[PDB]
């Protein structure tokens, strides 16, 4: 018994190696459950949900606050700016795999699986901008 087990194991058994607010022991498992870095899957699916999450809310800001927000046409300004930025952002994200070229044997996190998740990101972003598009139409 040296120092009586590290002053109470640094208070009631902390541990938590990959936890300190980066992702709790529940949240790190929630990240493994989270599709952006999902286990047991490859081509398209690691992405796809990425776009279905990003493009889904990209309609949000420019509908109420964008440079166009005072007439009836303004329901479209939230989507045109979003889709234009979606094309720009898709190019910017796809270019990362072109910059990387060291792990050509590790095709998942480098080039192959990288493009095989951004491919789902393109349809996810555009489609997700179209998914939240038809959600506020029946109430208007």
């Amino acid at each position: 018994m040296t120092d009586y087990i590290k002053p109470y194991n640094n208070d009631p058994f902390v541990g938590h190696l990959a936890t300190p607010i980066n992702s709790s022991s529940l949240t790190r498992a929630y990240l493994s459950q989270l599709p952006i870095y999902r286990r047991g899957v490859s081509p398209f699916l690691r992405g796809l949900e990425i776009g279905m999450a990003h493009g889904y809310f990209l309609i949000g800001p420019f509908v109420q606050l964008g440079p166009l927000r005072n007439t009836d046409i303004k329901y479209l300004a939230g989507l045109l700016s979003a889709i234009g930025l979606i094309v720009i952002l898709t190019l910017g994200m796809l270019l990362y795999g072109a910059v990387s070229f060291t792990n050509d044997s590790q095709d998942l996190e480098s080039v192959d699986g990288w493009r095989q998740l951004a491919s789902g990101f393109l349809l996810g972003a555009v489609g997700g901008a179209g998914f939240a598009y038809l959600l506020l139409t029946l109430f208007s």
Binding site: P7, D11, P12, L65, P67, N70
Partner: protein, 740 residues
Amino acid sequence: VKVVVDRDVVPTSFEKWAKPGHFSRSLAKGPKTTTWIWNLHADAHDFDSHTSSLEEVSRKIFSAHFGQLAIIFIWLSGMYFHGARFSNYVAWLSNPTGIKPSAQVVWPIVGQQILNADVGGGMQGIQITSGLFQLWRASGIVNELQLYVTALGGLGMAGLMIFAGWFHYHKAAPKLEWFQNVESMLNHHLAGLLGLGSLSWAGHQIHVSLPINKLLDAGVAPSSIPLPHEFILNRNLMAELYPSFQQGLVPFFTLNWKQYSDILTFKGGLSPVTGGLWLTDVAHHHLAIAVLFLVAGHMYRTNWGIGHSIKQILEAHKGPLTGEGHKGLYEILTTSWHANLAINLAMLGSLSIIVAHHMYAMPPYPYLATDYPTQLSLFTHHMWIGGFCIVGAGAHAAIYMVRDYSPTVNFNNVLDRMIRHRDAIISHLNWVCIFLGMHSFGLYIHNDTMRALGRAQDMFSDTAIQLQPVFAQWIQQIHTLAPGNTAVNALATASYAFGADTVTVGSKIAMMPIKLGTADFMVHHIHAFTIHVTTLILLKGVLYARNSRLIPDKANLGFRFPCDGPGRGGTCQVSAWDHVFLGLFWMYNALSIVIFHFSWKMQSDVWGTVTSNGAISHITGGNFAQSAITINGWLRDFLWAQASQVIQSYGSSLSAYGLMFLGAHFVWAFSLMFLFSGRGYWQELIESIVWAHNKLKVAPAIAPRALSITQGRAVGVAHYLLGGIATTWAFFLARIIAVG
């Protein structure tokens, strides 16, 4: 707790004064360099850079305490003198409105007599904004004789402190054991100083209030004012002015406290006669604070065995995220004279700011709210004082990790964690600063773009309704309904800045329900931006002062060092004292924006005039309902319209505030000489002048050298602040006199 005195340690001799630099053998044998001339004064107050014997360091700082204390007493004893020899306080005592304040006269030498401002009362001079007349009126002082007696009584107390700081030293000297009695120290500071101080002044404004309250507020001449001793020598006079004095400390023992309700009340708000807070509420206030401090002054171990102690109090506080928490903090504060100074400078610095806010919010002195120059000056005065003090708190909280922190002696796992996950603290504050910057000032860029672009500012009006009157509006409404409901014993709010539509006017507006709007959310977040950046850089200098990732051997170099060299791409300005040097600058920007906000928003919506045909007409009538949202309005309607009151004064008596205004930019831009150039070029610049000095041998024995790398930056911030305060000092004292 024991009388341990080391009588006679240092003799009384002029021998040390004969040697320039006796405090250090390194600053005595080699005065062959110009740099030594500046090192003699730079280290003159760095007492921990001489001897390490704490029994002598404690016997060199308590000496400086009594020395500074004597300087302050010499300073205060003159204020009562200037308000008697040449002033207008008695005439202002009879006529307070038409007679402007003044307590400084000039002489006919070079035509400077134009500064004699026509204030009235048969005396000309220079207007004052120190609040001396309000304090003296709130003290019951009427005759000039009461000024001279207080001044002559101040000379005695000023001399006794010099003969005290020269007593416990060249004559006496307590041991080192007398300083670890921090337990016995807080029992005499919270009870002897705070306690008896809040009680002694409380017992004064109970018997001196009626020469101000039940006399000077009725309409009696200053000659008809009775004497303060005539009220005490005859208890029935106090009994008639207050029908509670007939008892004379009889229900005080009977616990029939309600019979003392003629002086002890809790009204709230302001008085519609004087112009400030109630003269009876402050007496009861200080009585309430005095008893609380008489209780709070008994908390630590003396020599009877009862009570807590800073030791086991901190040895008991734990916490999950803290680990070995709070323990060792006793050894932190009881060993380093420095260590107490940062927590003092931090608390007292924020205290000066908080009391500055409490000044304008609820004016405690009579005839203070209407006196706009004094009010505006005093707020920003304590504002900048606390700015310097909090940065000094960072300046020394950076000293601690370098000068008095050890990995074996003093230990708190809390402070350990502040240095173990140290890269996380500043990372959080960094992202917070950037989020509060790219938006608060980003929205400034946004709105200034919307106006020059066209119809975008028009569609911003709905967003101008947002944020503003959305938050903090309900807080004011809570305070509107706080009396009666959550304050049954209060017939008024905390201040009339809370009570809506309730305006108190004494020919000039005293307070207003400060209706937030338009851009208060903007400037408050400019504040929070400049506050988080200031806290970031200073806290960075605090916890990165010991362990640094770039250079691991950081403790060897020091605190006020230049850098390391051109290696590692470039190690430049990495000292914690430089985080304070730049910390002074972000504090400078913070306090500058806060004084701008306070000052201008006042006359925008608060300060104004009143007529019977209408209601309220401000000096500048509701301008920052739009001119605050953009950066342009801060120099289109703010920094531009102010030149009509600072420059258009040469034909009057306000010409000095224009000369100091235009001359403060000189010394500020003079700081741009040191904050931009380097010692290398300037050192190549001397040797040419020294060549001309070697041509005629007129070269001094003291070899001409450039300023130190650190001393140049210390002088640079000195001028950036002096030249960066005297301009707004001349500006705050420019318009407020013309529009007073």
